Write the structure tokens for this entry.
Amino acid sequence: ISEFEKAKINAVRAALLENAHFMEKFYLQNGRFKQTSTKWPSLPIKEAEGFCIRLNGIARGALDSKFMLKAVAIDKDKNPFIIKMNENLVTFICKKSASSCSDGLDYFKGNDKDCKLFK
């Protein structure tokens, strides 16, 4: 049970690691220590590891200092949790849903429940 969580989380969180680089752009922009480092990560992930990566929430692209990074399980049953990426390099694991999968892989979902801080 619990092993599934961390394994599945890690898997799509690897895809969110792409988003960790995307949000890292933000880190590198907001905190420029070395100017020689040019950095443009662009998220090509819409779905990965049975979860979907979408830009949704406060924005749908880099606008302010906030970077919308969301991974939602296509199947909220096959996968009870959701993986959300915040600019703090932090993951939010919720049993709730924080968005929807526009890829139209197989299934859609809409449930709210428990949340968790993953740092």
Notes: Helices lie at 2-30. The radius of gyration is 14 Å. The longest helix spans residues 2-30.
